[PDB]
Each structure stands twice: as structure tokens, then as C-alpha cells.
Symmetry: D2
């Protein structure tokens, strides 16, 4: 039988590209989404047209709260419900916006940025492990975590936390044969919305090709880490950044 993967924030962009690739590799997929319901259903339709009964959606808010654990347990349950097994968890969903030190309340900023980037990945990881072949987890990290954007402190703390989870969980889950790794984009898939001037300025920063990563290039590193070619790899985070993190100010 075919393996199954949960991908969070899989309706659009990088998450969708990862889902599409996992599916092309032979995986059945849970497409988790929060607000992008239409895109998610559309993607599941498209994947099931390709191989019937190989994709479902699963809606969940991944903001921190007292029910987040139940919500993460339900995401993993939903993969067992639809496919009888859960082989891969990809923690991709992420809030991202500035939170300067000097609309939203601070308690809400905390709950969204730390919840999505750190606490949900930990809770999904617990639920993944508890419900348990080549088992692994891939956390979408950030290659720029040690050269942070101005006024992104909560976002940065969450991606830092996610590094620590990758390491702690690689360590603790190894005795169960579950590998835990990360993929760290630099800049990838610019908002088609974003001004051409700013897009170009980001592109000019990148040593390798003066362009952003495609979503597919990020997906490719995910595919490697979950593959049989990465069986001895745990606790490793792979930058997919074209050298961006290496460039001095």
C-alpha cells in the first residue's frame, strides 16, 4: 500500500508544491489548510482525478490556544481516518508579519506567530509519534534565522524554536525510527502581489542566479529528506537559499 503524508498550509504556494510532489512520488496526502478552503478542495480534486482516493483536506486553525493540542491530534487522526497510516508530517504552515518592539493585540500576535511556527509543530509531532516503514518529519525552517528582518522578533523566535524542536525531536524519536529534519528556504515564491521594484531588490541579493527559489526547488529538498536516500539523516536542516544566508551586510 502507498504511504501517507500530512502537509500543513498545503492549499497554496510552497505547501501545495510539497503536497503535489509527495503525491507524484506515490504518497496519499492530507492537505491541511486554515482559510484557503477553495484552493485546498481544488487541489484535492486534482490529485484524486490523478489517482482516486489519494487526497483529503483538513481544516484547522494552528494559532496557540488551549485546544491547539486537540486540533493537532485531529489533523493526525484525519490522516489515519482517510488512509490507515501516517508516514510523513511536513510542518509548513506559518504566520509571518512584523511585530515591532516599540489591528491585532500582542497576545494574538504571540499566539499566531509562536503557535504556527513552533507550538503546532511540537503538538503535531507528539500526535504523530503517539499514533505510531520510513517514518519522518520535515519542518520548514528559515535560512535567515540568525540574520533576522527588522521588527520580526516573534516570527524569528518561532523559527528559532522550530530549530530546537527539530533537534530535540530528532534526538528523542530516533529510538522509534522517526527521523526529524528541516528545510530552510531563503527567499522563494515572491508574492505576485509584491511590487516589481521590491521583488527585484530581493532577487538581486541572491548569489546563485539573482532569483528566488521556486516552490518546486524547496519541495525537492523535502522529497530527499523523506526518501530512502536519507535514512541515516536526522536532526539536519538543509538550507535551500542560493547562498543568501552567506552574504554580509
Amino acid at each position: 500500500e502507498a504511504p501517507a503524508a500530512v502537509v500543513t498550509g498545503a492549499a497554496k504556494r510552497i505547501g501545495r508544491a510539497i503536497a503535489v510532489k509527495l503525491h507524484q512520488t506515490g504518497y496519499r496526502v492530507v492537505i491541511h489548510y486554515h482559510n484557503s478552503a477553495e484552493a485546498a478542495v481544488s487541489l484535492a480534486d486534482e490529485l484524486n482525478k490523478e489517482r482516486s482516493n489519494t487526497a483529503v483536506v483538513c481544516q484547522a486553525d494552528l494559532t496557540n490556544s488551549n485546544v491547539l493540542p486537540a486540533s493537532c491530534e485531529e489533523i493526525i487522526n484525519s490522516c489515519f481516518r482517510a488512509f490507515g497510516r501516517c508516514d510523513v508530517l511536513v510542518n509548513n504552515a506559518s504566520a509571518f508579519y512584523p511585530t515591532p518592539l516599540v489591528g491585532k493585540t500582542v497576545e494574538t500576535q504571540v499566539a499566531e506567530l509562536i503557535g504556527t511556527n513552533a507550538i503546532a509543530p511540537f503538538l503535531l509531532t507528539m500526535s504523530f509519534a503517539q499514533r505510531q516503514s520510513n517514518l519522518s518529519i520535515v519542518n520548514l525552517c528559515d535560512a535567515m534565522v540568525d540574520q533576522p528582518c527588522m521588527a520580526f522578533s516573534l516570527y524569528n523566535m518561532g523559527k528559532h524554536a522550530l530549530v530546537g524542536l527539530t533537534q530535540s525531536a530528532a534526538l528523542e524519536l530516533a529510538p522509534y525510527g522517526i527521523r526529524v529534519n528541516g528545510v530552510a528556504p531563503g527567499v522563494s515564491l515572491l508574492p505576485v502581489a509584491m511590487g516589481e521594484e521590491e521583488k527585484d531588490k530581493w532577487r538581486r541579493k541572491v548569489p546563485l542566479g539573482r532569483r528566488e527559489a521556486s516552490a518546486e526547488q524547496i519541495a525537492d529538498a523535502v522529497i530527499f529528506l523523506v526518501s530512502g536516500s536519507a535514512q541515516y539523516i536526522t536532526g539536519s536542516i538543509i538550507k535551500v537559499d542560493g547562498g543568501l544566508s552567506l552574504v554580509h551586510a
Copy 2:
């Protein structure tokens, strides 16, 4: 006149050594605490006996919740209320206990305590500290073993990682306001009194420098340096004080 400092978790152990040293250097101090009310009150008394009205206490749970932003703002407000200024913030308070990924606190409470105390409260205190504003600085108590974590301590470790991120992000963001932000990262310091000596010696044996743990005072020494005029160009730096422990392979 004399500068002022807030030290969180300042009633006992490393926080207390930090407050005392800062006090000895001429600072007035806010001794924050949570449960150790007797220790905090006797510490303030000892210090005020030494110099009049140079120490006050401030109780607050730093678990993450909807009220944490107000509690943190009140901590900084207590410094201005007591002393008319707030020059230094030392984020030392920390919940520490295992949270296994696989098997009576609920996990959402463990999350709130471990990520609140170690990361979120630091961020909120930093916000209030900066908002309320010379040698201004913040020192965050980190952990030298953060990239070789203890088994079954994922939330604690996540909290300490997040705190490294905060140190960096805040150093960058507050640099234009002349606030430096640095870290001190102990390895093993002041082992629990309750821990058998024979258990303490298994930690001691791992330390290359002297086969022993750090004193509370040695940790405080790094804090005093970071807050001094000898460190005026230092920001975003995390100084390990671990006697080589983090260098030792398994």
C-alpha cells in the same frame, strides 16, 4: 544618581547572585519572584539594610496567558515607581522540567509555562522596557547546551532557542535606541540541594574546566561585565559560562 535594574526570578540561586552583584556595583534593584516570597522579601531587606530603599520586590507568574503583557508591563512599571528609571533588565526566571513527546499538568499548561517563562515573558518585558525609556541593556539567561538538548525536554529547549532569537532580533531592533541586548549561557551551575552528591558528581565529571559546576556568582560575573561600560560595543552576543561543557562530545 544610581541606575536601576529588574532581575526576574531573583529570589534564589542564580537570579539572587545577579541581583546582589548588581546591587554591590551601585544599582538599585527590583527583585521579581513567583512563589519564593519569603526569600525575595528577606533579600530586599538585606539589601535595603545595606543601602536604604535600593530594593523592592515584585511578584508575578510569567506563564503565558492573556494577562502576561499587563504583568510584564507592571514589572517594568514597578521599577519606574520605585526608582524613577530602568537601565537594565535581566531575564532569568525559567520553568524547567521534562515534557516527553511520548508516554498532572496538561500539555497546554506545560507549553504556557515553559515557553512563557523562557521566551514570551522575556519578549514582553523587553517591549515594556524599551517602550518606557546612559548605558541601557538587557541580558537574557540562555543555555550553553541548547544544541545538545537533554532527552525529553523539547519545550524547555524550544523556549531557550526562542530566547536566542529574541536576543538577536532585539539587539538589532533596539540598537538605534542605544539598548544593547546580550545573553549569558550557563552550562551546569548550582546543582539542586536535593540532588544526591553522587548524582551531582556525574555532572561535575563532565566539565572539562575543574570537573565542577559554576557558582551562581560566576554566572553573575558575566552579567555584570555585559552591563558594564567595558561592553559598550557588545550587542547580540551570547557568552557561554560553561567550563567547556558544550564542547564535550557524547
Copy 3:
């Protein structure tokens, strides 16, 4: 045309697996060796048996000296002369032995350890860049670089310098389309001079499976990095260590 690769220290062990696996993937290979002449030549025979005119040998000492630049230049030249092109360089050759701070002279130890692990990599990189598709370099690093073996200061210095090179060369060669990455093993192929209690000691520290990596698992990561699935990856070092680097003392 089939692409071509140079693997240093390729007669035995991990270099051999890398050569074999590159060859299996379609590459023509230069098998560099220092003292293992008989194994290099039988490896070449075996690969040419499989596909004719796809493997040659090149002997060189990679110790640091006044002639090291010309040696490295001639290694790269072997590949151009045999195969008309050089697409991949793998810097795998490495001296490794204790050099206590408190037999060989210390200057010899410096030359061997720093030469094999860093300066030869640097010169080979220069020669490779200068002679110039999917071009890349893969440096064999060490996952335990920040928790070094006692009394191994020069080896560790050399491996640190190799991280340095990986990073600097990634930045500098990105404009030419040359990627530069690293693979950092933990423990792999324990020596035979090693006792049973000693090997068991190492194996027991490895979280993922309580075992060393196979040479093939290390090679899997090299193949990935040189592949089209790593087109956006430069300056990245992938640990392949079963989580050994994460284990506190």
C-alpha cells in the same frame, strides 16, 4: 556527453562508494589516491568493465608543500585530458590522527592535516573553477566539528577551515553557476584496528539505530547535492550522522 567527476581519496571506504555511486548515476570518474594503488586500479577496472572508458586513476600526495598547487592542478587536468570536461569535484581525501598539544615532526603533522583537509581542497577548487551544465563541489566535512575529539586539534582546525572554504567558495563561485556544498558524516565504517568494546562504545552513542553509517549512506547525500534536485542549494552542509552531533556528554 556523460559528465565527469573527480573524487579525491577514492580507492577505499567512503571515497570509493562516492565514486561508484557517481559512476552508477552516469558520471565518468577520476579516482585519485595516495598510497592505495592496487585498490584504485581494481576500482578503475571494475568501473570500466561496466562501461568502457569511464574511469581513470590519478596518484597524488595532498600534504601541504610548495608543489601542492601543481599537484592539484594536475588532478583537475587528469579529468580534462581523459574526459574533455570536469563537472563535479568531491574533496574526500583526509589525514586523521591525534596531535596532542602537550615520530612525525609537528610541521609534518601541520602539512598533512591542514593540507589534506583544507589547503588541497582550496587549490583543487581554484583549479576546477579556473578551468571552466550542473557544476558543483562537495566537501567532506565532519558533523562533530564543534565537539571535537580530544587531542585532535589540527584535524579539527582543518575541518573548520573546510567549512570556511565551503562557504566562501559558495559565495564566490555562484556567479559562474558553480555550487559548493558539504556532507558531514558522524561515524561511518569503523576501522578494523578498533576493538569490539571500542566500536560498541561508538555505536551506542548514535541515536538513530545505534550504528555507524554505511559508506553508501554518505554517498547518497553527495549524489543528492550534485543532482538537479539540489539546483538552488549552495553553501549548505548536510549532516549524515544519525543524530550523533545532538547527544550531550
Copy 4:
């Protein structure tokens, strides 16, 4: 009696600032130098004017070669010769210049100077320091806060500084049982070259979050002094950035 320190490359700039501050704190100093003879002798002169028989100069090339081990042994021997003891070693001397991968110094010579001064000489001086030994023995290596965002075409320089990080770590671990601490100070930008144009200096200064200015020599020396002092007795294997936040800035 007064402790003694060796400072490599101490005739001017950061090394002089370090030697000056150790001396003021009470140390006897070996001022090592390579080309700057006049500057070194003149510094020793001042320091001796301040306290008699507390400074000496010591000439050595720290380019890698087969005699470098003897040269490093002689540097340390010179401390014992003049002062009867050697408590502190500061590895400050450093060659710095580009070595582009793609294209009148030969590459041999580039490898020798950059890797010699930044790494191999520090290793050999550390060996000789430990070998020649209530004390406070330590080593401070001058590292580089930008070691993971290297300058274009500085590969040999960067390799050398990376190797120095490794030495700092390896030596801390190995020399701990002897009571010898080993730490690093990692400047960002400090003391801009003399002839650099106002335009270029401005561009560097504007990159620094804390104050938009390079570090003073004294600022770097402050961190060295901290690490050698009794306030750092449990500190080993640590590298303190003194960079005004520079290393945290993305491009």
C-alpha cells in the same frame, strides 16, 4: 610578583591596545612584532618608563614554514627569559588580503601567510605556552565576527579564521585539565585602514546597528581583559563578539 603576557602583533592598532591594557592592569608584556620595529620598541619604551623592566619586544615572522614551530617556541621562551613566567597568550597577529579563486604573491605564499598567521602560528604558540608551564593561565584568540558571512574573494583569510575557531574549541577542551582557559574575541569592524576614502569608511560605519561606527581599539581590548581576568574563571571555549550587532545584519 607581576604576571606576564605575550601579545602577538602588538606594535600597533588592536594588539597595542591589548598590550597597553594588560600592562595597566599590572602585567609584564612581550610585545611581538614582524615588520613594525620602531613602533614596537617605542611602545616598550613607554611602558618601561611607566614601570621599569615590565616590557620587551620580540621579532618573529609567523608565516607558515618548517621553522615556524621553533619561532613560536622562541616567542614563548622570550617571555620566560625576560619575566620568569608566562600567564597569558594573546594571538592577535594576522595577515589579511584577498585571494580570489578565479583569475605578485604566489599562492604558496598566500597559503603560508594567511593560514600561518591566522591559525598555524596560534596552534604552535598554544603548544609552546602549554608545554613550558594558584594561577590564572589563559589564551585569547582574535577571531572574526563575520566568519560565516565572508567577504568576497577572502577564502584563505576566512579559512584561517575558521580554523582559529576550531583551535579555540579544541585547545579549551584539551588544556582545561591543566588549568588553561582558551577563549576568543571576535571583532566586527574596528580601526579602519589609514588611507581608506571617506566614502568607503562611511559605507562600513553605516552598516553597524550600534552607533553606526567601528569599534575603538580599547573596546576590543576591554573584552580581552575581561576574559583574562578573575571575572571569567569558569569561561573557556567562548568566543565573544564585539561587533555592535554587525554580524546580525542581513544583506
